[PDB]
Amino acid sequence: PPVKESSFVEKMKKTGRNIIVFYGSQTGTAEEFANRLSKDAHRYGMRGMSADPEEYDLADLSSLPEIDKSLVVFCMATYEGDPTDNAQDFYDWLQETDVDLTGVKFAVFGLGNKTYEHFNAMGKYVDQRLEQLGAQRIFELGLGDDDGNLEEDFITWREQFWPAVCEFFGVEATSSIRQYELVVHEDMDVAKVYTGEMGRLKSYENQKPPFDAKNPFLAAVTANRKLNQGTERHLMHLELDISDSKIRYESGDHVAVYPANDSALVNQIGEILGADLDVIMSLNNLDEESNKKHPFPCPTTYRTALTYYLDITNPPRTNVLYELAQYASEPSEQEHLHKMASSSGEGKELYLSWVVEARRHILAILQDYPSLRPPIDHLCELLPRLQARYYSIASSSKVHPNSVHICAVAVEYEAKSGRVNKGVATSWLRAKEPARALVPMFVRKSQFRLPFKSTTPVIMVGPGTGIAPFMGFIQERAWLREQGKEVGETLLYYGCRRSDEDYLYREELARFHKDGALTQLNVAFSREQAHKVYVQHLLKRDREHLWKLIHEGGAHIYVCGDARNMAKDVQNTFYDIVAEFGPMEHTQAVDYVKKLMTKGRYSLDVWS
Numbered sequence: 234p235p236v237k238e239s240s241f242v243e244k245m246k247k248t249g250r251n252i253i254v255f256y257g258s259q260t261g262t263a264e265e266f267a268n269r270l271s272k273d274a275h276r277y278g279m280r281g282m283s284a285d286p287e288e289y290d291l292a293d294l295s296s297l298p299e300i301d302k303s304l305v306v307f308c309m310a311t312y313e314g315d316p317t318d319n320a321q322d323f324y325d326w327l328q329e330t331d332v333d334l335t336g337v338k339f340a341v342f343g344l345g346n347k348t349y350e351h352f353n354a355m356g357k358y359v360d361q362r363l364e365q366l367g368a369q370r371i372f373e374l375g376l377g378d379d380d381g382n383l384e385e386d387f388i389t390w391r392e393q394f395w396p397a398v399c400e401f402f403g404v405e406a407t408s409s410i411r412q413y414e415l416v417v418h419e420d421m422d423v424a425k426v427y428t429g430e431m432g433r434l435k436s437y438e439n440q441k442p443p444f445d446a447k448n449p450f451l452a453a454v455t456a457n458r459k460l461n462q463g464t465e466r467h468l469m470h471l472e473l474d475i476s477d478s479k480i481r482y483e484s485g486d487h488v489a490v491y492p493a494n495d496s497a498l499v500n501q502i503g504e505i506l507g508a509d510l511d512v513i514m515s516l517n518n519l520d521e522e523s524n525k526k527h528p529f530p531c532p533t534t535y536r537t538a539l540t541y542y543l544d545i546t547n548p549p550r551t552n553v554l555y556e557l558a559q560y561a562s563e564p565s566e567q568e569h570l571h572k573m574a575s576s577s578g579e580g581k582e583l584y585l586s587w588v589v590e591a592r593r594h595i596l597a598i599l600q601d602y603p604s605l606r607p608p609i610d611h612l613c614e615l616l617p618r619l620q621a622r623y624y625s626i627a628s629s630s631k632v633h634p635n636s637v638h639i640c641a642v643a644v645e646y647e648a649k650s651g652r653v654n655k656g657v658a659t660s661w662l663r664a665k666e667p668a669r670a671l672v673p674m675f676v677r678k679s680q681f682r683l684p685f686k687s688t689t690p691v692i693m694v695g696p697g698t699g700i701a702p703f704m705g706f707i708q709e710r711a712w713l714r715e716q717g718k719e720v721g722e723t724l725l726y727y728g729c730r731r732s733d734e735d736y737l738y739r740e741e742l743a744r745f746h747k748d749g750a751l752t753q754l755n756v757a758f759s760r761e762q763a764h765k766v767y768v769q770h771l772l773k774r775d776r777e778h779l780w781k782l783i784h785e786g787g788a789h790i791y792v793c794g795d796a797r798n799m800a801k802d803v804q805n806t807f808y809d810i811v812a813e814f815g816p817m818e819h820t821q822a823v824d825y826v827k828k829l830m831t832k833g834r835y836s837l838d839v840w841s
């Protein structure tokens with residue numbers, strides 16, 4: 234129950250703002266777009282502000298007309314067909330309210346992903362809803378797809394948005410501007426310098442519950458072992474101690490962690506910029522009105538920002554490269570960086586393959602464009618924030634109330650940029666050894682859950698790391714039997730490359746099968762023969778029986794793992810199963826399946 238800020242309209246009035254951009258974001262993408270749109274306002278004679286809708290009462294939109302040439306934009310991302318956490322209040326309000334928004338001008342840009350059933354659902358709603366309430370759309374709804382390239386969809390929409398804005402309000406197209414000012418600190422107590430904590434100063438040292446995204450709990454790594462047998466890759470199992478954290482969790486929930494960048498990568502960035510990473514400083518908002526005093530916990534050292542608060546590995550967005558251009562002394566290199574923001578032509582094509590496709594991180598760009606030597610402080614201002622990574626808890630709270638398990642594949646690949654890229658969180662996690670190695674973390678509740686009725690059949694499909702949440706399920710179902718409860722069939726459809734290469738939890742799964750915790754352990758080994766053998770091939774094999782459990786046993790279906798292809802193929806296989814046994818046409822099988830998803834009997838936990 235957050236305490237709302239006062240009317241945003243009155244703040245707009247007091248600060249001569251005429252445009253406000255709200256962001257529905259969870260990973261900071263929509264939040265970046267909002268700030269870019271808000272900043273853009275200046276280049277058109279207007280002045281805007283960015284804002285988290287959760288901190289305000291959107292009912293005040295009805296007051297927006299009181300401002301001449303006022304306008305509100307919504308950059309909303311979608312999550313499982315739902316609004317982001319910070320946009321829930323707004324969502325619920327849009328449904329219940331009946332307020333008249335006559336005179337209100339708006340525009341919406343949604344951040345979606347096409348390979349989802351509910352693509353840009355939130356943006357579609359906000360856009361349609363504001364109009365029903367009586368507001369008037371000032372520019373078409375933007376439909377951004379992260380499946381293709383979201384950054385590009387945004388550029389295209391944006392490039393057309395402002396001209397429309399200008400034409401309607403009749404404003405002219407009226408300049409590198411810093412958002413913060415640098416303040417070095419030659420001397421000051423070490424007790425007031427942030428060293429990586431995410432919120433309250435010294436919150437990592439002095440831990441006080443409850444713990445969450447703002448006040449993560451530093452859990453000790455009690456176990457970290459290699460799960461796979463072979464050496465092709467590195468899959469690992471970690472156990473985090475959460476005793477005395479008061480944290481509650483259930484199988485199906487996710488555990489997030491705040492990682493630390495590679496120190497060598499941090500040191501190189503400083504070295505190539507001739508900067509002293511150990512300088513203590515702060516970046517204070519040049520706009521004293523905003524509640525955002527700094528871009529990250531300050532005061533702090535550059536080293537610390539680059540290590541715990543900044544994203545130095547994902548490809549830089551076009552606006553960041555656009556601003557850096559000024560710092561490239563070699564003409565041709567300044568030109569390339571400047572054109573990265575293009576909505577077409579060689580500039581766009583160059584950005585797409587040389588930066589995105591090749592996965593060049595900031596350091597790589599600084600090395601391939603040697604004339605580019607920006608001042609460290611302005612760089613830290615442009616870089617996006619370092620995000621937490623989520624992992625499907627691999628343990629059951631019934632069996633391990635004080636411990637959270639993680640099952641992850643360490644990311645490390647050859648990038649077309651020529652260098653080897655390392656995953657921020659997994660590299661960091663992998664290096665944690667039980668001593669007091671700690672991991673900042675918090676739990677996030679999910680809807681991925683075992684059936685309430687212990688007798689309800691369970692069908693789990695989780696190839697590769699998709700097995701994670703299922704180890705928790707199996708433990709819990711095994712615990713239920715020990716507890717004298719009556720458990721229905723528990724079926725696992727797992728998959729890996731080779732039984733002697735990356736068969737995760739081989740020994741543990743064998744045990745559960747032996748004791749009957751698992752009614753069936755169906756494993757598809759994709760590479761032990763010439764043709765591929767996948768989990769869906771096993772589902773098809775056991776189609777008759779699966780149908781029986783589904784249509785007559787009320788079994789719950791669970792799919793975890795890769796969302797690009799595996800989840801879809803598994804889904805298609807279930808369509809064919811229903812269609813054959815119902816029986817019914819494909820179209821009716823798709824409806825039947827989707828229904829199971831709404832009635833909570835077909836759940837997902839996939840990612841990319």
Ligand SMILES: Cc1cc2nc3c(=O)[nH]c(=O)nc-3n(C[C@H](O)[C@H](O)[C@H](O)COP(=O)(O)OP(=O)(O)OC[C@H]3O[C@@H](n4cnc5c(N)ncnc54)[C@H](O)[C@@H]3O)c2cc1C
Nearest residue numbers: 622623624625640641642644646656657658659698701840
């Ligand atoms: C809800 C949810 C549940 C998840 N559960 C788990 C889980 O239980 N176990 C688990 O292992 N992961 C899981 N993940 C993934 C996890 O959150 C991280 O994305 C993953 O561990 C990699 O993070 P990282 O920081 O190590 O790598 P990052 O530094 O975040 O890099 C990730 C990016 O590297 C790029 N990349 C990876 N390989 C290549 C390549 N070969 N070529 C080009 N680009 C590539 C991709 O853009 C990828 O997005 C889950 C994610 C979500 C959202």
Ligand SMILES: Cc1cc2nc3c(=O)[nH]c(=O)nc-3n(C[C@H](O)[C@H](O)[C@H](O)COP(=O)(O)O)c2cc1C
Nearest residue numbers: 258259260261262263310312313314345346352353
């Ligand atoms: C767990 C998860 C669930 C998602 N669910 C959806 C979804 O239902 N629909 C959709 O269009 N996009 C979905 N996406 C994609 C995001 O909408 C897209 O990546 C967006 O750019 C994220 O913006 P943010 O960083 O501002 O939250 C999902 C992404 C993740 C990681």
